[PDB]
Amino acid sequence: SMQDPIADMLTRIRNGQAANKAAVTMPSSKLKVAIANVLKEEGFIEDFKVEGDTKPELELTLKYFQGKAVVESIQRVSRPGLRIYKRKDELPKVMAGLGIAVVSTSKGVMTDRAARQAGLGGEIICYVA
Amino acid sequence: ATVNQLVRKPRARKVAKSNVPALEACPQKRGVCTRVYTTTPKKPNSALRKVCRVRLTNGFEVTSYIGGEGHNLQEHSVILIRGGRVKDLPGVRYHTVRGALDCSGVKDRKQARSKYGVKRPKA
Amino acid sequence: KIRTLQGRVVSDKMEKSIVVAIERFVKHPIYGKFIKRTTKLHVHDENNECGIGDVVEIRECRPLSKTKSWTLVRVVEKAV
Amino acid sequence: ELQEKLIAVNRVSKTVKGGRIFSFTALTVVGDGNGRVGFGYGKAREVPAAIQKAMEKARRNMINVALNNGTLQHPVKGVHTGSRVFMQPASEGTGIIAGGAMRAVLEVAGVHNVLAKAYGSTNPINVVRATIDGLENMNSPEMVAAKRGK
RNA sequence: GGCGGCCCCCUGGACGAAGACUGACGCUCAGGUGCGAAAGCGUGGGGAGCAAACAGGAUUAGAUACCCUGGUAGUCCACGCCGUAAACGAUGUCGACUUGGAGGUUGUGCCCUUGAGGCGUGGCUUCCGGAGCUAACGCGUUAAGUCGACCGCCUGGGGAG
RNA sequence: CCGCAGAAGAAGCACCGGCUAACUCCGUGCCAGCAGCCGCGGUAAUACGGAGGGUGCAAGCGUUAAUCGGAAUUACUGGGCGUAAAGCGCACGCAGGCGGUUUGUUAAGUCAGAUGUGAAAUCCCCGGGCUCAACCUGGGAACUGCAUCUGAUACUGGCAA
RNA sequence: GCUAGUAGGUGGGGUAACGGCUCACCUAGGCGACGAUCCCUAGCUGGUCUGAGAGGAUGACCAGCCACACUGGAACUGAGA
C-alpha cells in the first residue's frame, strides 16, 4: 500500500465492516490510530484497541448492524503529491447539514464540524457520510 | 438493421440531405450576376427561371437562383445572396433576394405584407 | 533581511567567480508539484573553499560586472 | 383515500409468419398520505386491464420513507447499471422540482420538497427501477443516531 | 513466437535452500536500445514427398476450374534494413485483501510409512463463496467494491490511414 | 395642476401543423414553393399558394450572419477506458513521476490573523430622491493573490538517528 | 538546430542609474529535447450576452496603453511636440 500512505485504513475497514466481521486487524501508523480516535468518539465503530505498546498494532471493533457497512457511502478524495487544502469558510457541510467529514489541520485530525468550531482550515482526508 | 444499406432512406421525410460545398468567408453576399444562363434540357420543364453565375474567390465556380417574381433580373445588377437549394435545380447552391436596386420583383402582389415588404390595399 | 539561497556548486571557469545554479523558488499557479526550472546564480567567489561537492548559502550584493551580484556565506551541506 | 398513477408503456406489436401480433403492458405506483409509497408492473389482453394488474401489485404494503417533515434528511443510493442515481434534498419550503419522467414515485404520498431530474438515462423504466430500491434501503432519524453511538 | 529423436560445447532462465555480508543499491517508462508471425530485396545455392503458380486431357450454359498422373514456390536459411496485422482479463504498475473451501498439479516438513496419504505447506493453475455491488442472461475479494504513481493512447459523422 | 369640449384622436404584426400557441373553406399537381431539427406537396397537400375567422402579444411580431444551449464534454477546479474513440506484439537503460516509516527535530508550502492594496459604477444587499417605473444614487459589504509579521504543528519538502 | 560584442575575462570608458547597454584586446566561451530556433493569429483589463459554472467567447462603455491624424522617417524650437 506504500504508494498511498495511509489509504489502506479506509479501504480495509469498508471491506472489513461489509464482510460480516465484528473485527478487522493491521499494524499501526503516524495518522491511522488518529482516525480510529475520531471514529470511537463519532461512534461509527463499537471500539478500537491499540495492542502491543513497544511497537503496536491497530484493531477496530466493527458495527455490524443489519449485515451492511456503517460507512458504505465514504469517499477518500485527497492523494499523494497532489494535496487538497480548504479555508474555515470552504470546509465541508455534508448531507444537506446532517454531517460528517474528516480533515487534518494544525491541531491534529478531527471532523469538518470540529475544525469549523475551532475556526480552522486544513487537508480534506474523507467525506465520511 | 444493416447500416450501410439502412442509412440512406428509412423513415424520415424532411431529411438532412443537402450537399452545401465551399465557404471561404460567409454564405450570404452581394452578387455581381457575372453572366445570365437560360438553358439545359431536363424532365423538369424549367422555362423563364434564368440562373446566373457569381465571381467569388471560392476555389471553384458558383451559381444562384431568381428567388421569385420579377422578369427584369439583369446581369449588371448587384442584389443580395442567401442559401436554400430547391429540389427542382441541379448545379445551383443559393437563391437571391432581388427587391433592391432597379430590380422590382414584387409588382403589386398585396399578400407579401412583411414577407418581402408591401403597403396596404384599399382597406 | 538577506534572501539566502541553497546554492549547489555546479560550475567553475574564472578565478574570482563561480555558478551555483538551482531551481527558481518564485512560483506560479500550476499543477501541484515543485517549481523545477533553473536560474543563473553567478557569484563573485574569492576563496574557492566550496570547490565541487558542497551546498553554499549565498546573499545580495552589487553586480560590479554582467549579472554577477551574489556573495558567499557558508556551507549548508558538506562537500557531497 | 389512497393515490394511484401510471408512468410507462411499450408499443409491443410485431410482424410474425404471418400478418401482425399485438400485446399490452404497464408500470404503476401507489401511495398513502402518511409518507408511504409503492410500485409494480402488469400485462393483459386490454389496456385498462394492464393498468389494474399493475396497480393491484403496487398496493403491496407501501414503504414508509424517512420524511421529517416537508423534506428528507439523506440522499440514499438508487444503485443501477449507469443511472446513477442520487436525489438532491431541498430546504423545506420550495417544491418537488424532480424528473417528471418518474415524479409519481414521490408525488403519491404528498412529499413537498425534493429534486433532481433523470441524471443518466431518459428512459423511465431505468430511473423508476432504481428509485424504489433506494427508498426500501433507507434509515429513520432514530437509526442514524445508533449508527453514530448507542 | 516456437522446436519435439539425444547430445558435445558456450550453458537462456531458473529457483528450492542452511547460511554469510552490506543497508532502497528499489519500483515502473516516452523518443530510443534490442527482438520482430505474413511479406519484398536477396547473393550463391542446398534442389526428396505434396501442392498456389506451371501444364493439359476432361465435365463445359463462358471453367478464366476444382480434379487427376506430371507441378514449383512454400519445407527452412548462413548473414541481415525487417514495425507488425487478428500477440482482446475486448484490460498495466500492483499492495494490502485472510468467511473460504472444491479440484488439476508439483517441489516438499511430520507419521509403528500397517494405507488406496492421514496431520499438514509454499508455488504454478483453476473451480465459482458473501455482505455489497445489483438492468436480462448474472457478475459475487484479490475479479469491475473501495484505493493509489502515469510513460501513454481518448477531439463525434465524411475527411484517413 | 385647475375649468370646459369630444370617446373623442392611438395599433398592428407572426400568423394559423405539433415546438410556447387558436383551423378550416379550398386551390395547383412534388405547379409555384417554406427547406430549421422535424414536417410538408406523390388529385381530396391543416402552416405551400388564395381567403374567412380569430390567436400568441401589444410598439411591438416574426426572424436573421452565427456558438454554446437541453446534453453531460479536454475536466489542477468537472472523466470515461466490454462499448463511439477505448492499456498501443516489445523493454536494454538515460532523463523523469512514486520512493520504506517513525522518534528527536524545522516551519519554506498548510492554516489562523495583524496590517496594507483593489481611490469611484460593481456583481451581492438595504435606504432613499424626482409623481415615479425607470433613472439618479447613498450606505453596508465582500475581492483566493501580493506585501510585511504574530502564531499554530496534522499533511507537502526536509535535517538527525 | 540557435549564438558574434555574442560569451567570460581584461581594462578603457561614461550613463541620472545596472551592464557584451558597449569600443578595443586576451581568449572560445553562451543554449537545446525540465521546448535553444521560428512563428501562427491575436489588443490586453477591469468588466461581463449568458452563471452552481469551473468552460465556449469579447476588448469595443470608461479610461489605461498606445499610436497617430497624407505615406512618413526624423532632428531642431518649447517646462510641456
Side-chain angles (χ1 to χ4, degrees):
Chain A
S1 73
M2 308 174 144
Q3 213 78 278
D4 195 353
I6 59 59
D8 78 83
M9 179 65 169
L10 289 327
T11 61
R12 180 63 164 287
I13 79 136
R14 187 216 284 256
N15 286 291
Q17 192 151 247
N20 355 131
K21 301 144 55 157
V24 81
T25 200
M26 56 188 78
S28 191
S29 169
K30 189 74 195 298
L31 212 83
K32 291 186 193 181
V33 69
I35 300 149
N37 209 91
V38 175
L39 287 159
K40 205 188 169 177
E41 194 179 319
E42 289 298 343
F44 291 107
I45 61 181
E46 298 291 312
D47 186 23
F48 85 105
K49 191 158 72 63
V50 58
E51 188 47 75
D53 63 80
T54 184
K55 196 178 189 181
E57 292 186 13
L58 174 60
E59 308 176 335
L60 296 69
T61 298
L62 276 38
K63 191 163 181 80
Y64 77 95
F65 167 69
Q66 71 162 88
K68 202 191 182 211
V70 176
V71 305
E72 57 81 0
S73 54
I74 187 169
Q75 213 298 270
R76 214 298 302 264
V77 69
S78 176
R79 73 273 208 208
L82 192 59
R83 289 332 188 199
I84 334 171
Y85 294 120
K86 290 291 153 131
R87 303 153 187 75
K88 88 203 182 288
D89 86 58
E90 292 192 293
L91 282 208
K93 299 185 176 48
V94 296
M95 306 297 228
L98 196 77
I100 70 158
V102 165
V103 307
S104 306
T105 187
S106 202
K107 285 298 208 284
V109 198
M110 70 284 282
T111 68
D112 62 329
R113 306 207 301 330
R116 280 189 279 95
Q117 195 200 250
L120 299 171
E123 183 73 83
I124 308 309
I125 299 309
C126 66
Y127 316 100
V128 183
Chain B
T2 58
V3 294
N4 206 77
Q5 287 285 104
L6 192 277
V7 66
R8 312 192 300 239
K9 66 184 180 193
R11 232 97 273 245
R13 33 282 213 245
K14 182 73 210 64
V15 304
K17 213 145 226 92
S18 89
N19 175 245
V20 292
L23 195 289
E24 223 70 55
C26 61
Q28 306 191 102
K29 227 57 66 76
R30 289 285 184 143
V32 282
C33 287
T34 301
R35 177 44 19 74
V36 66
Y37 302 109
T38 190
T39 208
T40 308
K42 291 291 183 181
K43 300 318 180 205
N45 293 296
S46 303
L48 305 176
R49 297 148 91 205
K50 55 158 53 185
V51 175
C52 75
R53 79 179 284 194
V54 206
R55 182 54 262 178
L56 296 175
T57 296
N58 273 178
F60 215 70
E61 304 182 41
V62 299
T63 67
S64 296
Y65 184 61
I66 62 47
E69 66 195 86
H71 184 67
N72 196 23
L73 188 48
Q74 223 264 30
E75 194 182 89
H76 286 249
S77 200
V78 62
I79 71 314
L80 287 287
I81 309 314
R82 62 145 281 171
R85 205 286 301 262
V86 175
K87 83 273 299 212
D88 283 30
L89 270 293
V92 167
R93 295 286 181 284
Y94 305 104
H95 64 247
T96 56
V97 42
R98 53 56 62 79
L101 304 174
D102 297 290
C103 272
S104 193
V106 190
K107 276 161 173 277
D108 315 313
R109 182 179 161 232
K110 72 263 185 56
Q111 321 93 274
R113 178 75 178 130
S114 68
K115 214 181 202 220
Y116 302 84
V118 306
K119 101 295 177 329
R120 295 191 192 89
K122 287 196 295 151
Chain C
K1 307 298 84 178
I2 44 187
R3 282 153 183 77
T4 62
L5 282 296
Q6 299 167 249
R8 287 253 41 258
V9 182
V10 283
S11 297
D12 182 34
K13 190 178 76 165
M14 316 99 168
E15 314 224 309
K16 297 220 305 280
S17 321
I18 74 179
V19 196
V20 295
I22 60 47
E23 56 282 77
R24 191 247 297 173
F25 190 49
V26 186
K27 308 97 169 184
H28 35 243
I30 189 158
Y31 192 75
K33 303 299 201 200
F34 213 90
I35 193 81
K36 282 302 166 158
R37 183 173 177 85
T38 72
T39 186
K40 185 182 174 186
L41 302 173
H42 282 229
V43 184
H44 192 314
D45 193 35
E46 186 184 274
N47 313 0
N48 215 224
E49 58 195 301
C50 64
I52 192 151
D54 288 275
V55 177
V56 287
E57 179 162 284
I58 80 187
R59 75 178 185 126
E60 326 90 280
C61 287
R62 180 173 171 171
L64 302 154
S65 53
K66 182 192 182 198
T67 220
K68 180 193 56 194
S69 295
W70 300 99
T71 61
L72 296 160
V73 193
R74 56 91 51 129
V75 167
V76 172
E77 217 184 69
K78 292 194 75 192
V80 57
Chain D
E1 74 167 282
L2 268 81
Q3 289 201 107
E4 300 198 309
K5 215 210 192 62
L6 79 300
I7 293 156
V9 73
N10 291 111
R11 197 159 78 264
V12 60
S13 51
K14 207 176 46 44
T15 49
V16 62
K17 190 167 178 180
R20 199 170 185 117
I21 42 165
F22 61 83
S23 194
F24 302 123
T25 65
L27 183 270
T28 69
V29 296
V30 160
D32 180 52
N34 197 112
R36 268 186 287 261
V37 300
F39 91 130
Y41 297 79
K43 167 167 176 160
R45 190 109 281 234
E46 277 156 82
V47 172
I51 316 305
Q52 300 164 201
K53 198 181 286 52
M55 292 186 324
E56 198 87 285
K57 225 168 279 77
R59 289 171 205 135
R60 287 165 175 270
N61 281 75
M62 293 74 88
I63 190 81
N64 259 125
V65 178
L67 297 164
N68 185 37
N69 185 259
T71 196
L72 86 173
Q73 69 306 98
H74 79 270
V76 63
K77 84 204 302 187
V79 286
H80 261 48
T81 214
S83 82
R84 153 103 294 271
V85 71
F86 290 104
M87 292 282 159
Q88 180 146 247
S91 185
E92 215 163 48
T94 187
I96 186 153
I97 329 190
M102 67 275 186
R103 185 189 295 216
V105 299
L106 286 146
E107 215 190 29
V108 291
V111 183
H112 286 38
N113 288 272
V114 62
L115 57 73
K117 80 169 181 286
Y119 166 103
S121 179
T122 329
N123 188 8
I125 309 293
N126 210 337
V127 67
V128 174
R129 286 173 32 149
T131 42
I132 283 66
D133 287 325
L135 297 174
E136 78 92 83
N137 227 260
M138 273 180 93
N139 282 194
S140 170
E142 306 286 354
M143 276 186 182
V144 294
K147 288 197 163 176
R148 84 107 49 81
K150 194 63 64 164

